[PDB]
């Protein structure tokens, strides 16, 4: 039994709410998951060599956002039998 | 039994809500998952060599946003039998 | 039993809502999944060599947004028997 | 039993809603999945060599947005028997 | 039995709420999970060599945000039988 | 020898203005004045002139 | 020999203005004045002039 | 020989203004004055001039 | 020989202004004055001029 | 030979202003004065001029 009321006013507002469940607000928010940012470099001479044989190799600048549910999550997996 | 009321007003508003469940608001928000950003480089001489044999190789600038449900999630997978 | 009412007003509004479930609002929001951005480089001489034999090689600037449900998700997969 | 009412007004509005389920609003929102953006380069001399034999090679600037349901999703897959 | 009321006012507001459950607000907040940021370097001569055989190798600048539910989560996994 | 290769430039730009008004009541009673309550995006590059208003919103000018 | 390769530039830019008004009541009674209650994005590069208003919002000018 | 390679620049920029008003009541009664209660984003690069207002919000100018 | 490689620069920037007003009551009764109660983001680079207001908010100027 | 490689610079920047007003009552009765009660972010780089206000908020100027 909720009641509001205004009378003999020049500017009146009557708000009446019985039950309320507010919700989530993301205002101007930020989120970063698995991020690289601003990787500056100055190298007069650069050399990068990779010699992979039957394996997994992951080089360079990498960013990964990985959600696995029922499996083996990895970035570089190698397996033999 | 919710009730609002306004009377003898020059500007009146009567709002009456019985039950309310607010919802999610994303106002001006940002989200980054698996992102690279601003990778500057100055290299007078550069060399990149890769010699892969029966394997997985992942180089360079990479960004991955990977959602697996019922499998093995990876970036570089190698397998033998 | 929700009730609103306004009387003898010059500008009146009577809003009455019995039950309400608000919804999601994305106002001006952004989202990035698997993104690269602003990769500047200055290299007077550049060389890139790849010699793949029976394997998987993934180089250069790559962005991947990969959702797998019932399979092995990867960026570079190699398999033998 | 929801009721609204306005009387003896110069400008009146009577809104009455019994049940409401609001919906999703995307107003001015953005979304990026598997995107590259602004990849500037200055290289007085450039060379790119690839020598693939029975394998998978994926170079250069690539962007992939890949949704697989019941299969192995990849960017470069190699398989033998 | 909640009640509000205003009378004989020039500017009146009558708010009456029976029950309220406020919600989460993220206003201007930030979050970083698995992030690298500002990795500057000056190296007149650089060399990077990797010789992987049947194993997993993960080098360079990497950022990973990895949520696994029912699997072995890793960055570099190697297995044999 | 200038070179623009894929460059960008924004001079006097209004970009990406989003707005939502949901179930908002509103009652205005204006008498000889200005009442602004809506979206308004103005973008200019050059506005040159003495005694000149370059962008006005809800303005009331009564001089002598 | 200038070179712009993928460069960017923003001079006088209003970018990404988001706004939400949900279930807001509002009652204005203006008499000969200004009332601003809405979004307003102004972006200018050059505004040159003596005695000049470059951007006004809710302004009341009554001189003699 | 200047070189801009992927560079950025922001001169006079308003970026990312978020605002929410939820269930806010508000009652204004203005008489010959200014009342500002809304979002307002102004971005300028150059504003040159004697006796010039470069950005006004809720202004009341009554000179002689 | 200047070189900008991935550089950034912010001169006169307003970035990331968030605001929330939830269930706020408010009652203003202004008479010939200024009342500012909203968001206001101003960003300028150069504002040159004698006797010039570069950014005003809730201003009341009555000279002689 | 200057080199900027991934550098940053912020001159006159207002960044990340968050504000929340929850269930706040407020009642103003202004008569010929200034009342500021809202967010206000001002960012400038250069403001040069004799007798010049560079940023005013809730100002009342009555000279002779």
Q: Residue I58: left if φ>0, alpha if ψ -120 to 50, beta else—which one? A: left
Contact I15 H16 (CB under 8 A): yes
The whole-angstrom separation of Cα C49 and Cα F47 is 55
The whole-angstrom separation of Cα G55 and Cα H46 is 12
The whole-angstrom separation of Cα E7 and Cα C76 is 74
> What are the CA-CA distances from residue D42 to residues B33, B41, C40, C77, H6 (Å)?
29, 10, 8, 32, 10
Q: What share of chain C is helix, strand, coil (3-state, %, to 5)?
A: 0, 50, 50
One-character DSSP codes across J17-45: E--EEES---EEEEESSEEE-S--EEE-S
- Experimental technique used? cryo-EM
The whole-angstrom separation of Cα C75 and Cα A57 is 12
> What are the CA-CA distances from residue J58 to residues E22, I33, J34 (Å)?
33, 10, 5
Q: How many residues are there in chain D? A: 81
Which chains border H (3 or more CB–CB pairs < 8 Å)? Answer: A, B, C, D, E, F, G, I, J
The whole-angstrom separation of Cα I26 and Cα I34 is 15
Angle J53-J56-J57 from CA coordinates, rounded to 5°: 170
A77 contacts: CB under 8 Å, gap ≥ 6 = A56, B72, B74, B76, B77, B78, E56, E74, E76, E77, E78, E79
Which helix H or strand E contains C50, and what residues bound it? Answer: strand C45-50
| Per-residue exposure over E44-71, b if at least 16 CB sit within 10 Å of its own CB, e if not | eeeeeebebebbbbbbbbbbbbbebeeb
Q: Which residues in chain B have their CB less than 8 angstroms from residue H27's CB?
A: 11
Q: Which residues in chain H have their CB less than 8 angstroms from residue J15's CB?
A: none
Distance from CA of J63 to the nearest CA of H (A): 10
- E27 SS3 class: strand
Record the tokens describing residue J11, joined without a space.
Answer: 């001159």
Q: Is A37 annotated in some ligand binding site?
A: yes
Q: How far is residue H49 CA from its own chain's centroid?
A: 18
The whole-angstrom separation of Cα I26 and Cα I23 is 10
What distance separates the 2 farthest-apart alpha carbons in chain E?
88
Distance from CA of E80 to the nearest CA of J (A): 43
Record the tokens describing residue I54, joined without a space.
Answer: 């570069």
Q: Where are the alpha helices (DSSP H) in H1-64?
A: none
Q: Are I22 and A27 in contact (CB under 8 A)?
A: no
Q: Are B17 and D15 in contact (CB under 8 A)?
A: no
Is C69 buried (19+), middle (13-18) or exposed (0-12) by CB count in 10 A? middle
Q: Are B31 and B51 in contact (CB under 8 A)?
A: no
Nearest to J21, CA basis, from A23, G23, I24, H18:
I24
Q: How many residues are there in chain J? A: 64
Q: Which residues in chain C have their CB less than 8 angstroms from residue I2's CB?
A: none
Q: To what resolution in angstroms was this structure determined?
A: 3.1
The whole-angstrom separation of Cα D77 and Cα B77 is 10
- B19 SS3 class: coil
Q: Where are the alpha helices (DSSP H) in chain C?
A: none
Q: Are J22 and I24 in contact (CB under 8 A)?
A: yes
> What are the CA-CA distances from residue G18 to residues B28, D29, F19 (Å)?
5, 10, 6
Place of tokens 């990026």: D32
Half-sphere exposure of A16 (CA within 13 A, CB side): 33
| CB nearest to H20's CB, from A10, A15, A25 | A25
One-character DSSP codes across E57-75: EE-SSEEEEEEESSS---S
Record the tokens describing residue J9, joined without a space.
Answer: 């610079």
The whole-angstrom separation of Cα I56 and Cα I59 is 6
* Three-state DSSP string of D32-80: EEEEEECCCCECCEEEEEECCECCEEECCCEEEEEEECCCCCCCEEEEC
Record the tokens describing residue F21, joined without a space.
Answer: 């008004």
The whole-angstrom separation of Cα B47 and Cα B57 is 17
Which helix H or strand E contains I31, and what residues bound it? Answer: strand I27-31
Identify the bridge partners of residue H9 per DSSP, sorted by sequence position: none
In angstroms, the first-to-last Cα distance of chain E is 73
In angstroms, the first-to-last Cα distance of chain I is 55
Q: Where are the alpha helices (DSSP H) in C11-70?
A: none
Nearest to F4, CA basis, from D43, G10, C41, G7:
G7
Q: Could you count the other beta carbons within 10 Å of the beta carbon of residue H57? A: 31
Nearest to B68, CA basis, from E65, A34, C73:
C73
The whole-angstrom separation of Cα A74 and Cα E75 is 5
Record the tokens describing residue C33, joined without a space.
Answer: 């999944």
Phi/psi of residue F51, each to 5°? 60, 35
Q: Are G45 and F45 in contact (CB under 8 A)?
A: yes
F7 contacts: CB under 8 Å, gap ≥ 6 = G4, G5, G6, G7, G8, G9, H4
Distance from CA of H19 to the nearest CA of B (A): 7
Residues of B contacting chain I (CB within 8 angstroms): 28, 38-42
Angle B64-B66-B71 from CA coordinates, rounded to 5°: 140
Q: Are G29 and B11 in contact (CB under 8 A)?
A: yes
The whole-angstrom separation of Cα H36 and Cα G46 is 25
Nearest to D34, CA basis, from C36, B59, A60:
C36
Q: Helix (H) and strand (E) counts for chain A?
A: 0, 9
What distance separates the 2 farthest-apart alpha carbons in chain H?
61
């Amino acid at each position: 039994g909720v009641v509001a009321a205004a009378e003999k006013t020049k500017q009146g507002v009557a708000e009446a709410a019985g039950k309320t469940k507010e919700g989530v607000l993301y205002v101007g928010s930020k989120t970063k998951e698995g991020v690289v940012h601003g990787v500056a470099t100055v190298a007069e001479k650069t050399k990068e060599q990779v010699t992979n044989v039957g394996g997994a190799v992951v080089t360079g600048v990498t960013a990964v956002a990985q959600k696995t549910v029922e499996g083996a999550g990895s970035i570089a997996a190698a397996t033999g039998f």
